Design a protein around this ligand. Structure first.
Ligand code: EQ3
Ligand code: EQ3
Ligand SMILES: OC[C@H]1O[C@@](CO)(O[C@H]2O[C@H](CO)[C@@H](O)[C@H](O)[C@H]2O)[C@@H](O)[C@@H]1O
Ligand code: CL
Ligand code: CL
Lengths: 314, 316
């Protein structure tokens, strides 16, 4: 009855924060130097009210060799290396960066920012003026909510380095998988209007980093759609995504609606807050989960949407 | 002194219509059925104000075989075929579509629209309910200028069919290159504040479809950046782009500023109107040309920008 494409259309009144890919698209039109300066100014302004959690040694170890190379470079080489990352050009550093998971890339840029503040790495020239288009993009970023602001920043960091297509040699570099939280120390979510055990186990397993028990809730046909990404189809691909990108998330669902669909299927929409380990309690992202469960109550499809405003929570 | 990347930053106060790639990015997030219905509704209201020029036989011949296949299909097959096009899925029709130039693809969709109106091809339902996000995107499109509206529509059409980005080599079907109009009968542009012959020959050669004389004005290192696209580097690549995508354009430049730069280079900004053969006089796109000429006055880089508003025409 249902396909992955048909399932994408569930709960069509859910207004996603499409200002995020819109702003990214606007950002992509700018020159490399403008792109680098805009992020510098957006990050600096963000830091005045939003505090970032410094990355641990386990994250820093992977980007250590690349950072030490940039640290031993000349100011023109350091600048060119950063321009190459933003331009997506073919360089050994860009190829090394390309192989990293989002968290390694984020941790790498956090360290470079600290180096730029300390004068260890060439800074954004004091006499730098953003283009008319870059200035308007910066105004847009300052006008959107913190959850949308950090998503814009993350997507820009991820989109850098040599194009992953046509690798030649690529060991996907990701952080080690932290053992799942002790069952005795686990918390259980409560969702007003939702008592479906698959949905509840989904939230609880992810909050405990229990990816092996989390993947069991998915059908063989199953798929997961992260915000503004295409659906990730199959248990193997979904599990890899969990292990590489979904460690230490805090899902705080509040309320939801469970509705019967055609041919024994179940449509469940949940809204709540999500905390990223990069900011913790400092940023509460407005999230909606759109579940399409098969007649066996297994996850055939789950869409995770970044919401336009807190109004979308109800 | 200058590189292609450095040249992209010339005249940084030029405010481009980035609402176009922003709206495209928003559009790309929608489902295939929503994407197709949104274009149907955007095109229908646009048709009431902005009249499209029907494609000639020379354009229609390339999409004829594909259109006849869809014409002989069932309503569910016809719908699936159009859904596949929007979804960028791997099917023979999507692979055929991917080989086509923007004009063939546009002409193909124009014919399908006529078939949908005539009931020959499965139409968009009664009062199709667009998603909350699709409705807001449609409002955005209705709120932007005609030049920005048609650019959004064209870019969506171009992005359909099989994705050939992961392919090192792909077949390319394009309209025949019509030989340029005779030199004596040609029109000559006049730009208030710009008398540089390379800039003037650029406008005049393109208005006459004289791509061979147009490419001669470009340096071997030369590049051309179309609106919201990456720069096309080299004479071979730039000439192919002219021959496949730049036939029958009408450039109406109005005014500009010529400024000397570092190491004998010249920075020239021109603003004016551009007419596409798809709409003719019905749509006047607000355009800026950002030229970076080498000390030999050859085009090292030229950026063509779709402007945010007609106010940007006076911004020099
Ligand atoms: C790039 C750059 C610079 C560096 C900037 C930096 C350090 C930026 C860092 C930004 C950060 C840390 C952003 C973090 C964002 C995290 C986000 C948006 C987390 C999102 C996760 C979510 C919504 C989880 C979603 C999920 C749930 C809830 C599920 O149910 C299943 C999985 C899934 C992942 C979809 C500087 C140095 C400043 C200037 C230079 O010129 C350029
Ligand atoms: C796709 C679709 C449908 C079809 C709709 C149709 C037929 C849409 C077609 C729209 C058209 C014809 C759009 C064309 C726009 C043309 C434009 C934007 C041309 C722009 C050209 C410019 C700006 C030229 C610039 C240049 C200049 C000035 C230079 O100096 C150098 C060359 C260069 C090209 C860069 C329907 C059937 C309605 C519904 C279905 O569900 C889906
Ligand atoms: O020429 C580009 C493009 O313009 C279209 C738009 O309909 O055709 C116009 O120009 C043709 C000459 O090139 C005329 O034969 C035609 O009548 C006119 O509409 C497309 O067909 C073509 O791809
Ligand atoms: Cl995260
Ligand atoms: Cl055109």
């Amino acid at each position: 009855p249902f396909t992955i494409d048909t399932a994408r259309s569930i709960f069509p009144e859910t207004l996603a924060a499409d200002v995020v890919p819109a702003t990214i698209a606007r950002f992509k039109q700018l020159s490399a130097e403008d792109q680098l300066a805009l992020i510098w100014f957006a990050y600096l302004e963000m830091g005045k009210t939003i505090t970032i959690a410094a990355p641990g040694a386990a994250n820093m170890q992977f980007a250590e060799n690349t950072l030490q190379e940039i640290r031993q470079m000349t100011p023109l080489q350091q600048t060119q290396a950063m321009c190459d990352l933003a331009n997506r050009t073919d360089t050994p550093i860009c190829r090394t960066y390309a192989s990293w998971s989002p968290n390694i890339k984020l941790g790498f840029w956090y360290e470079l920012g600290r180096f730029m503040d300390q004068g260890l790495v060439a800074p954004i020239p004091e006499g730098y003026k953003l283009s008319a288009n870059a200035n308007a993009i910066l105004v847009t970023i300052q006008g959107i909510d913190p959850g949308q602001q950090i998503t814009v920043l993350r997507n820009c960091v991820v989109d850098m380095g040599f194009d992953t297509s046509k690798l030649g040699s690529y060991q996907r570099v990701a952080e080690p998988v932290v053992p799942p939280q002790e069952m005795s120390q686990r918390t259980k979510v409560q969702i007003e209007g939702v008592t479906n055990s698959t949905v509840l186990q989904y939230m609880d397993n992810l909050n405990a980093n229990d990816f092996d028990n989390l993947i069991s809730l998915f059908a063989e046909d199953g798929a997961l759609q992260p915000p503004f990404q295409k659906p990730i189809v199959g248990k193997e691909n979904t599990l890899r995504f969990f292990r590489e990108e979904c460690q230490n998330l805090k899902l705080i669902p509040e309320r939801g609606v469970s509705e019967p669909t055609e041919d024994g299927y179940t449509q469940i929409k949940v809204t709540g807050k999500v905390q990223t380990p990069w900011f913790g309690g400092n940023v509460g992202m407005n999230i909606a989960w759109r579940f399409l469960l098969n007649p066996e109550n297994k996850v055939f499809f789950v869409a995770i949407d970044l919401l336009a405003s807190p109004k979308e929570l109800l």
